[PDB]
Write a protein that binds this ligand. Structure first.
Ligand SMILES: O=C(c1cccc(Cl)c1)[C@H]1CNC[C@@H]1c1ccc2c(=O)[nH]cnc2c1
Lengths: 337, 20
């Protein structure tokens, strides 16, 4: 049944995986409005598609910067994976294309902003609020992992809240399809599993560890391992010690001890019963997984929405022109994009 | 309090990914 669903899902995913959509729009088809976020090798902007008037979020990557940061293959992974997946809590890729200078991915615009912004402002979420979001991640990971995908960058900065108050997972820049083990040091310091820090060779269990960090941060207001410098964060992560706020329920602590488990033969998500050890944990006893998947559960809050194109749920960023060189850069490197 | 220690730390803004 779940197995039945995942089978058809894999069948759909593979058709697209083997025959990726490519070159499905052009820069001039979009009016650029405002930067929604920005950092290494690119930015994401709110745009309007001229022929339809729809708004989208367009990620713009500078090919030369991608090459210097050694992110060529990770970028190809991101686009090939995003064009192939389909799940209610995964942001959709509607168009992609490239020009002499940049790569572009045009995604649904999610006007409610990042969970990060809301969580930092409110301080922490109640357990029922955190459980509502955590449930959607659990199902999204059940989906991605069944397609042999590892996501590798779970954090509130990468989770958007939509107009119904549900989560859309974005930022697939480190996602990878791999059977068996992989070794790349990537992720965000507060969310790395011990085996990534220790250069061990790792698999989807790192996403389940990251879910434990995320649930902790949502419910506490701060992550379980924090310091002023990454090295001190890593020393805390590998120590085997974790402390919980005194307001955490006993069921919540027990789930987190099993997720934030350094020993892989004991980490929930990674045992004989797979994701079911998580879905059937007492902390989730009230969660109706089907109702969540169907978006039938009432959300903890609906973001304020002041009209189409409104960005007030996003921070302001310095704006920079989109320059397109008269010469093609890095054509060979990104030919399959 | 742990919360006060977090709020006074330099890592309450958006966190960058790492890579080699
Ligand atoms: O700005 C971003 C980004 C992420 C990776 C590379 C570059 Cl260049 C930019 C991402 C970071 N976390 C979320 C942010 C973002 C913001 C809005 C949307 C959106 O409205 N639809 C889809 N994805 C988004 C991502």
């Amino acid at each position: 049944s779940v197995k039945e669903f995942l089978a058809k899902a894999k069948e759909d995913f593979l058709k697209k995986w083997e025959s990726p959509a490519q070159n499905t729009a052009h820069l001039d088809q979009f009016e650029r409005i405002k930067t929604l976020g920005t950092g290494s090798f690119g930015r994401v902007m709110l745009v309007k598609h001229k022929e339809t008037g729809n708004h989208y979020a367009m990620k713009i990557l500078d090919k030369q910067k991608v090459v210097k940061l050694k992110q060529i293959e990770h970028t190809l992974n991101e686009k090939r994976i995003l064009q192939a997946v389909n799940f209610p809590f995964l942001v959709k890729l509607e168009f992609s294309f490239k020009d002499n200078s940049n790569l572009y991915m045009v995604m649904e615009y999610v006007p409610g902003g990042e969970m990060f912004s809301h969580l930092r402002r409110i301080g922490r979420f109640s357990e029922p609020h955190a459980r509502f979001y955590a449930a959607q991640i659990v199902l999204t990971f059940e989906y991605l992992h069944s397609l042999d995908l590892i996501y590798r960058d779970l954090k509130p900065e990468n989770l958007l809240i939509d107009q119904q108050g549900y989560i859309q997972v974005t930022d697939f820049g480190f996602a990878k399809r791999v059977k068996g083990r992989t070794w790349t040091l990537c992720g965000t310091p507060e969310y790395l599993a011990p085996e990534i820090i220790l250069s061990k060779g790792y698999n989807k269990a790192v996403d389940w560890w990251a879910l434990g960090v995320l649930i902790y941060e949502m419910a506490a207001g701060y992550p379980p391992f924090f310091a002023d410098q990454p090295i001190q964060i890593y020393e805390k992560i590998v120590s085997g010690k974790v402390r919980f706020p005194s307001h955490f329920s006993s069921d919540l602590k027990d789930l987190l001890r099993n997720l934030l488990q350094v020993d892989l033969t004991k980490r929930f998500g990674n045992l004989k019963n797979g994701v079911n050890d998580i879905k059937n944990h007492k902390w989730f006893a009230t969660t109706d997984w089907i109702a969540i998947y169907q978006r039938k559960v009432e959300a903890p809050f609906i973001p304020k929405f002041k009209g189409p194109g409104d960005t007030s749920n996003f921070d302001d960023y310095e704006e920079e022109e989109i320059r397109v060189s008269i010469n093609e850069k890095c054509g060979k490197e990104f030919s399959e994009f | 309090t742990t919360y006060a220690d977090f709020i006074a730390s330099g890592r309450t803004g958006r966190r960058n990914a790492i890579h080699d």
